[PDB]
Write a protein that binds this ligand. Structure first.
Ligand SMILES: O=C(Cc1cccc(Cl)c1)Nn1cnc2ccccc21
Ligand SMILES: O=C(Cc1cccc(Cl)c1)Nn1cnc2ccccc21
Ligand SMILES: [Cl-]
Lengths: 298, 305
């Protein structure tokens, strides 16, 4: 029993964090094999023109107490790739993956190439993340673990005026309509990840919370007409198919659970909680629910 | 900006997890130097648990009855001893991944990270607190016994908890790394229940200071309170008594925000009376009590918004 916001063990990622300094700027880098990946804004804009003026010796890379020698540099979108002389012996099995909004991941927050904390979060439908970062956290990475392979999905770049965060995949492509410069940028209006709230309601049923269940069902069309009015993401047939295993384990059909969410949206909780929460939680995917209520190891 | 429930990076602890098997039971162990620490209930059967005599069960065991596995390598057990509710298995190989560590016994209200493991393999990490009734609201399944709770302030790992059992209400009970239980619990399948839980008042106050640091002041009022009047009100809402020590501990946050502890106490009194009225504090519709004053100073900025 128990349901917590759970992150993947960070050990394989901790052994990859380094400090990158260029002039007055200092941020974090990801050392995989003989390449250090970091936000290109460390050189700060006409980034190709700013990069051509730099030499390898201008970039100071530090792994623990050891200085890594930069022997080459190139840019890929909004990420700077620094070729180093030493390959990382702690390099894990990994891949670079781009995630979709609604998917969750773990963030290893770092300052000065040193990891300070780990937390779980989700890519919002508006492509921002509600993280916890201070100045110096740029270059911190987001990841998932699938068996023994680390899938790197996010690199932190900036904080928006509302306190939310923006960044890129490991190939330097931003999530959202953001750019890596000082200008007027704002997060778009956000929505609730419907498939995730449903998964979290199934997790509550698994943990013995059934007060919100009703005898009713709904059509997918009627549910979406209601959901759109509460700023909830449209629920697709794919989401319904993905919730199949949880539906079978609990004996509650997806559209049966949708009628429960419809009643919670129109009436509220009435002084009650679900899994210790007075709000409907949308940062656990159907896969996160299955993994936590089965004990999958890495 | 932002405020998340943040756990310590688990890497230094991951390199210490091993699998311990004794007969049919399999659980987790903590390998530090040449010793593996695990719950002593690994020697018990399901039947034994009603009224086990651990000393009598242990005397019948030999070193080779205990199977220890670190990754794909079988460790050799060369000694065994019991210290309270923990079994200490002397092994022939010292752990090369042993970090700088210490065993610390924590007080209720203190937070820590839990590295949940099954079969000597870590599966997840989360943050939680020692409740005033000495239980933890964890997320554990069968096979998680031996999972540990820790803090990593600076470069040293302070081990404070080892998982032993789940109570009928779904909450968890365990020991410090010297085998002494937190709470009036026993590693016995006897009728045991968690005492009535209370809210950790000093932690809710710290979390209200964190909200002020992040730019939120909607809940503040023009009133102050005496410590005694605050406690008379707090007790009626199942809140832990706030002591003078708690007030002294909140001094730095009070100075950084310019809001006196008893003025923050008056705002808490008002929040308990009125509720939130459709509003949230740091993305939460409930008053959060699992962030200590030290956690807030650690996570939050030194400059108030
Ligand atoms: O946002 C920036 C600087 C920046 C300015 C312009 C463009 C870009 Cl890409 C970055 N730094 N940053 C990142 N996370 C932070 C959290 C709290 C404060 C500052 C933080
Ligand atoms: O509770 C026990 C066994 C046990 C019974 C009686 C006393 C003692 Cl010390 C141990 N194992 N356990 C630990 N966390 C769990 C979570 C879900 C199911 C079982 C779980
Ligand atoms: Cl303590």
């Amino acid at each position: 029993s128990g349901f917590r916001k759970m992150a993947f063990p960070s050990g394989k990622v901790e052994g990859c964090m380094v400090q990158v300094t260029c002039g007055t700027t200092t941020l974090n880098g990801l050392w995989l094999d003989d390449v250090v990946y970091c936000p290109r804004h460390v050189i700060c804009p006409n980034y190709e023109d700013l990069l051509i003026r730099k030499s390898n010796h201008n970039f100071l890379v530090q792994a623990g107490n050891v200085q890594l020698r930069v022997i080459g540099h190139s840019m890929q979108n909004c990420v700077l790739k620094l070729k180093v002389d030493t390959a990382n012996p702690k390099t894990p099995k990994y891949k670079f993956v781009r995630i979709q909004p609604g998917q969750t991941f773990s963030v290893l927050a770092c300052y000065n190439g040193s990891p300070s904390g780990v937390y779980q979060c989700a890519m919002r439908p508006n492509f921002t993340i509600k993280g916890s970062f201070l100045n110096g956290s740029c270059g911190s990475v987001g990841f998932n673990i699938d068996y023994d392979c680390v899938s790197f999905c996010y690199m932190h770049h900036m904080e928006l005026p509302t306190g939310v965060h923006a960044g890129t995949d490991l190939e330097g492509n931003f999530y959202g309509p953001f750019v890596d410069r000082q200008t007027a940028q704002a997060a778009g209006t956000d929505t609730t990840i419907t498939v995730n709230v449903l998964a979290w309601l199934y997790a509550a049923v698994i943990n013995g919370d059934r007060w919100f269940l009703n005898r009713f069902t709904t059509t997918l069309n009627d549910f979406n007409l209601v959901a759109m009015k509460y700023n909830y993401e449209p629920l697709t047939q794919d989401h319904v198919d993905i919730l199949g295993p949880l539906s079978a384990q609990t004996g509650i059909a997806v559209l049966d659970m949708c009628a429960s969410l419809k009643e919670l949206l129109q009436n509220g909780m009435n002084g009650r909680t679900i899994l210790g929460s007075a709000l409907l939680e949308d940062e656990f995917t159907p896969f996160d629910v299955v993994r936590q209520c089965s004990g999958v190891t890495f």
